[PDB]
Ligand SMILES: CSc1ccc(C(=O)Nc2nc(-c3ccccn3)cs2)cc1
C-alpha cells in the first residue's frame with residue numbers, strides 16, 4: 001500500500017533527474033515502481049499529482065527544519081544566525097534539485113503547485129519579518145523599511161537565486177558561493193543604515 | 194508591410210492583457226490585425242514568434258534607456274543614482290506588464306525566449322558589476338563580496354520581485370512600495386560592512 005506509493009514517488013524523483021515531467025509517462029512511473037498502469041491510477045490521478053506530492057514533501061521538510069531551528073537557537077552572532085537559517089533552504093532544496101526544478105516550472109501550469117508554493121512562502125516571509133521585528137525591538141537592527149516588505153524581497157531573492165544556482169542557469173551565482181552571497185545581502189539590508 | 198506587422202504586434206499585446214498566450218489563437222491575432230490567417234503566417238511563423246518579438250522590443254527599450262542613463266548621469270547622491278537606474282526597469286517593464294508576464298512564463302517552454310532573457314540579464318549584471326567596481330575603486334564602497342556575484346543576486350532579486358509585484362502574486366511587495374524596497378537592499382548591500 002504505502003510501499004507502492006513510496007515506490008512511485010521514488011521512481012518519479014529518479015526519472016526527474018534526467019528528463020522533465022512532460023517527457024515522463026504514467027507507464028514509465030508504473031514500470032519503475034513495479035506496478036501496472038491501472039494500479040498506478042489507484043494511488044495517483046496523474047503524473048502531475050505525483051509531482052505535487054513530491055514537492056509537498058520537500059517544502060514540509062524545509063519547514064520542519066526551520067521550526068526545529070526556531071526552537072533550538074544556535075548560540076552565535078547575528079550573521080551566523082541568518083546563515084544557519086538560510087542554509088536550511090540551501091540544503092533542503094539543494095538535496096532535491098530535480099523536484100525543485102520541476103516544481104518551479106509546474107507553478108506556471110498548476111494552481112495546486114502555485115498555491116502550495118504561495119502558502120509556504122507566506123509562512124517563511126512572516127517568520128523572517130517576525131525575526132527582523134524582534135531584532136528591532138531589542139535595538140540590534142534599525143527601523144528602516146517595513147519589515148514584512150523587506151522580508152518579502154529577501155525571500156523572493158533567495159527563491160530565484162538558489163534555484164538559478166541549482167539549475168546552473170546562465171546567469172547564476174555558483175552554487176559554492178550562493179550561501180555567502182545571500183547572507184551578505186540579508187545581513188547588510190537588515191542591519192544597515 | 195511593416196504596418197500589418199505592427200498591427201499584429203499591437204493586437205497581441207492587447208489580447209495578452211486579458212488572457213494568456215495559450216488562449217490566444219492565430220485566428221484571433223489575424224482578426225484583430227485585419228488580415229487573413231495565411232497573411233499572418235507571412236509575417237510570423239507562430240503566435241510564440243509574435244510574443245518573442247514583443248519581448249525583444251521591451252527588453253531593448255529597457256536596455257536603450259539604461260544606456261542613455263549611463264551616458265547622462267544625473268547629478269545626485271549615490272542612493273539616487275541607484276534608484277534612477279532601477280527605475281528604468283520598474284517603468285519599462287511596468288508599462289508592459291502583459292508582455293512581461295507572458296514572456297516570464299514562456300521562458301520555461303521557449304529556448305528562444307530563455308536565450309533572449311539570459312542575454313540581457315548577463316548584460317545588465319555586467320553593467321551593475323562595473324558600477325560597483327567603480328564605486329570601490331574611488332573608495333565609496335567597501336571590497337566585500339565579488340562584485341559580479343553581488344550584482345547577479347541583486348539583479349535576480351529585481352527580476353523576481355518586480356514581476357511578482359506587477360502580477361499581483363501572493364506574496365509580493367505592493368507595486369507602490371517595490372522601488373523603495375529594492376533601492377534599500379541594493380544600497381545597503383553595495384555600501385555596507
Ligand atoms: C532565517 S529565516 C529564512 C531564511 C531563508 C529563507 C528562504 O530562503 N526561503 C525560501 N523559500 C523558497 C521557496 C521555494 C519553493 C516554494 C516556497 N518557497 C526558496 S528559498 C526563508 C526564511
Ligand SMILES: CSc1ccc(C(=O)Nc2nc(-c3ccccn3)cs2)cc1
Pocket residue numbers: 252274275277278279282309310311313314317318320321348351352355
Ligand atoms: C543601475 S544598474 C541596474 C539596475 C537595475 C537592474 C534590474 O532591475 N534588472 C532587471 N532585469 C530584468 C530582466 C527581465 C527580463 C529579462 C531580463 N532581465 C528584470 S529587472 C539592472 C541593472
